[PDB]
């Protein structure tokens, strides 16, 4: 069964705010499967979100990042007039610094060819052929990625912190995000377990599906 594609991630600053944390920019410790899936779609230049349902993603967290709070005069749609001071609101947003993680992509469950794994591979062998827009980022648009490269299981030859889907875990990461409200958002309960493996454990495989 073809070896799943592995990507090495290194993002200087990132923030994965919580669905229900709308008053505060308080973030998940780990990139949620939905955000990673969206970033992979951006890398392969896939605007449609339903194109690559079924791809299984597993995240290995190389180093636990530090959580820091920053202030931002974020703009909101409260008043019809743009210049009205009610639009600008000062609030805090948490960020994760020096995030290094490895991503496993298993697109065997996809029913549409070419699969996401093939698209990512072909993108990496021939960067000039792939046509897309924007700048690759994880989380917020301004949080660019320092390094995303094809890597093996031995790239750090170290000890890995996996995200494992436990029914009694702490983190509640969403694998499908409903941006308008919260109807279609689907959550899975995870945990961070420190294990010395170069391959993800089964449970660690998070398979993205439509909310239906």
């Amino acid at each position: 069964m073809i070896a799943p594609l592995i990507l090495y991630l290194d993002v200087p600053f990132t923030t994965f705010r919580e669905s229900h944390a709308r008053e505060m920019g308080k973030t998940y410790p780990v990139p949620p499967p939905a955000t990673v899936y969206g970033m992979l779609l951006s890398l392969v230049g896939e605007t449609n979100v339903y194109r690559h349902c079924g791809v299984e993603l597993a995240i290995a967290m190389l180093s636990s990042p530090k959580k820091s709070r920053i202030l931002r005069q974020m703009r909101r749609f409260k008043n019809a007039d743009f210049s009205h001071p009610e639009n600008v609101i000062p609030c805090y947003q948490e960020i994760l610094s020096n995030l290094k993680c490895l991503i496993w992509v298993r697109s065997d469950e996809e029913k549409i060819q070419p699969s996401l794994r093939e698209r990512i591979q072909l993108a990496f062998d021939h960067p000039e052929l792939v046509r897309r827009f924007g700048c690759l980022f994880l989380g917020e648009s301004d949080q660019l990625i320092k390094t995303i490269k094809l890597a093996r299981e031995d790239y750090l030859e170290g000890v890995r912190q996996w995200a494992i889907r436990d029914n009694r875990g702490r983190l509640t990461l969403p694998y499908w995000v409903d941006h308008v409200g919260s109807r279609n958002t689907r959550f899975l309960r995870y945990r961070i377990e420190e294990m010395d493996r170069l391959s993800p454990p089964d449970l660690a495989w998070t398979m993205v599906q439509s909310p239906i």
Partner: protein, 494 residues
């Protein structure tokens, strides 16, 4: 029978707030069966089956009446206007703690008057040490918690809705609509059972008052509210923990740091040496953005994970270091929190050495000696922790060296002292402090230290650890050596 409402902690979609609301459901139903063991009593003949991590509901007839009875019994208001949550044991809770919890809940959950109608401001003069301090609070009359049953159930069928229900920030803390112009669409939605959990969250979470160390408490009454929300591992464990924490005094709840409140929430937990203790909780800070802010805003959320070592160290700090001074003035029961305790607690949570920089806080920063006096009151405790610090060793040996040197100097003064005259040992100690504080650079301070060590005489400790103390003097910055010399002078005890 079949469950019309099914709730399990093992469900994947649940969050921490859903779990704490589940615990609130568990405890309120426990208190209800304590109050109404005859299921009949429950208007609607509700029947609850409770397990370690599952709450199970059946009733008879239409849902609307059943949930209406449940909600009306769950949330109530006494004659004084304070909150009455049956989940918490109000009988053994005094009136001061009742005022505390009621003020907290209106300050964090019922922050908006669109959800509650208030009564008249009721002032009562409670008597402490022959002082009748007038506690002034705003009584309530109604709130959205008592009448959420209308939204929970369908209007026409008087039954629970089979679709997602739009919720608001009063139900789920932090769930405000970012864009008001899109209020109808961009609203958080949840299933009815999770909505009930978000109804019953307030019972579990405790409320604490935060005091800014920079702000004089006399010139600023506390208004920041810390909400401690604990991670749920078992219904019974959480219920027992909350009921234990009910025992504490209000003056304990006034803290100087978020970590202090988190540790206080786990201060009364039993310690078992066979069982690996590990507890996690969230602290949610609510604070007015400006002086004229109408309602509080969520300004900080911080996770606390407490293990065995951290908790026993915190108990040790609580034992050695002094408690809060309950200053009481004209209706002004101020509370003096020891900054050091918080500093240690913070470092403990950080996992970093407790002795990160106590002296800086105690003296450099604390010229007023607010916590420096606490140092005086808890200097032994400081030394105790320093003793725990292995790295301190070398500085401990230097402390002994300086104490021996000053012993020799005091012996020389005693020899110089004339018969009948009183030797000025206190004056000499004050002179030592003044001379050490006068030293302005490395060269002068090292000159004075070496001269004093020579004048002390033969030092056993400086002989045993010759090379180590010599290298410590050569390497350490002179400010640090001055600090430890001052500590040696203050810690001298013949």
């Amino acid at each position: 029978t079949q469950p019309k409402i099914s709730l399990s902690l093992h469900a994947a979609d649940t969050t921490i707030m859903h779990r704490v609301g589940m615990t609130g459901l568990y405890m309120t139903l426990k208190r209800l069966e304590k109050q109404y063991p005859l299921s009949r009593q429950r208007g609607g003949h509700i029947s609850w089956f409770l397990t370690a991590d599952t709450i199970e509901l059946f009733w008879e007839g239409s849902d609307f009446i059943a949930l209406s009875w449940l909600i009306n019994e769950s949330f109530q208001l006494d004659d004084t206007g304070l909150i009455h949550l049956v989940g918490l044991d109000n009988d053994r809770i005094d009136l001061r703690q009742k005022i505390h919890i009621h003020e907290g809940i209106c300050g964090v959950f019922l922050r908006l008057n669109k959800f509650y109608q208030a009564g008249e401001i009721i002032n009562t003069e409670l008597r402490f040490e022959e002082k009748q301090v007038e506690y002034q609070y705003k009584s309530l009359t109604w709130y959205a918690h008592q009448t959420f049953a209308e939204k929970l159930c369908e209007a026409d069928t008087q039954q629970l809705r089979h679709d997602y229900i739009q919720i608001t920030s009063w139900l789920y803390l932090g769930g405000i609509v970012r864009h008001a112009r899109t209020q109808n669409t961009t609203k958080l939605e949840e299933k009815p059972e999770y909505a009930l959990a978000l109804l019953f969250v307030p019972v579990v979470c405790h409320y604490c008052l935060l005091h800014i160390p920079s702000e004089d408490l006399k010139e600023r009454k506390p208004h920041r509210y810390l909400v401690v929300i604990p991670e749920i591992k078992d219904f019974e464990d959480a219920s027992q923990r909350r009921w234990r924490l009910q025992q504490l005094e209000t003056k304990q709840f006034h803290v100087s740091s978020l970590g202090e409140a988190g540790l206080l929430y786990y201060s009364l937990d039993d310690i078992q040496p066979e069982v690996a203790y590990y507890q996690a909780c969230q602290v949610w800070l609510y604070e007015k953005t400006n002086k004229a802010s109408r309602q509080r805003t969520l300004m900080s959320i911080e996770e606390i994970k407490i293990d065995k070592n951290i908790l026993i160290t915190y108990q040790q700090v609580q034992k050695y270091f002094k408690t809060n001074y309950q200053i009481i003035k004209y209706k002004q029961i101020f509370i003096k929190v020891n900054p050091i305790r918080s500093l240690i607690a913070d470092n403990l949570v950080k996992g970093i050495h407790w002795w990160s920089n106590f002296w800086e806080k105690l003296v450099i920063e604390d010229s007023k000696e607010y916590l420096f006096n606490q140092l005086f009151s808890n200097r032994e405790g400081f030394i105790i922790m320093a003793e725990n610090s292995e790295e301190d060793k070398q500085y401990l040996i230097f402390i002994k060296v300086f104490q021996q040197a000053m012993k020799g100097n005091f012996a020389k003064i005693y020899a110089k002292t004339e018969e009948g005259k009183d030797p000025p040992i206190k004056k000499k100690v004050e002179r030592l402090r003044a001379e050490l504080n006068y030293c302005y650079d490395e060269l002068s301070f090292k000159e004075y230290l070496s001269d004093f060590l020579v004048r002390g005489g033969l030092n056993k400790y400086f002989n045993e650890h010759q090379e180590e103390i010599a290298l410590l003097i050569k390497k350490s910055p002179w400010q640090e050596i001055r600090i430890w010399s001052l500590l040696a002078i203050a810690s001298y005890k013949p």
